[PDB]
Design a protein around this nucleic acid. Structure first.
Lengths: 111, 111
DNA sequence: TCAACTGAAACCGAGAAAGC
DNA sequence: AGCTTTCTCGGTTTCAGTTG
């Protein structure tokens, strides 16, 4: 399973604005989640994390495949949904604000 | 897939005035479609089918959610649009009359 | 004026399928 | 094999834009 450490690395990297830890224990984080239809939407910035997952897993090849941010978003979402390593704290997510984000908890390796 | 048999059941039920079959083969039907801004509009009657779909899918809970007929209508419209089981006969729909309705064909499961 | 309405497209959870 | 990520499906939600 690559998702757990890859995502932890992405947050720890500080390369994705808004992809940040919410506590110092590094067990809860925010992941920017902007709807791709908004005017506010900028693919280069708002799709960067989804694309990186597609690039990292080889499901998209720069220069060869047509860019498809909607598909990229679905892949990371479904991976998070089915992952036993991550749990959305849905009551804490902020999808209705100008810079929307979902909140995820990282499950301890024992549960 | 729940919409096809659910809607057939609603028509067959006869509980929704104006929600009726257009032939005896039960392959074409009418769905009352009154604009919610009209004075003629009665929520309890004109939104009953839309509400029933929202209740059936758990998208509206009495005691939890505020009544919102426009959302109920949008939900059923978009589902009909996207479903391969139903096709609007737009030339037969009557949106310009005092009791407006849309006409739908039910596509055979073989197509 | 603005609530309701719209097609199109983006989005969604879940189970099957695919992949390690 | 058993685990993790992806594909498929049947709707749902949101978008800019229109309508009554």
């Amino acid at each position: 399973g690559k998702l757990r450490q890859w995502l932890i690395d992405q947050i720890d990297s500080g390369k994705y604005p808004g992809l940040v830890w919410e506590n110092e224990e590094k067990s809860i984080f925010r992941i920017p989640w902007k709807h791709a239809g908004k005017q506010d939407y900028n693919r280069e910035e708002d799709a960067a994390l989804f694309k990186a997952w597609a690039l990292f897993k080889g499901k998209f090849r720069e220069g060869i495949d047509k860019p498809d941010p909607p598909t990229w978003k679905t892949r990371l979402r479904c991976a998070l949904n089915k992952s036993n390593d991550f749990e959305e704290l849905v009551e804490r997510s902020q999808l209705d604000i100008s810079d929307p984000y979902k909140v995820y908890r990282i499950v301890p390796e024992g549960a």
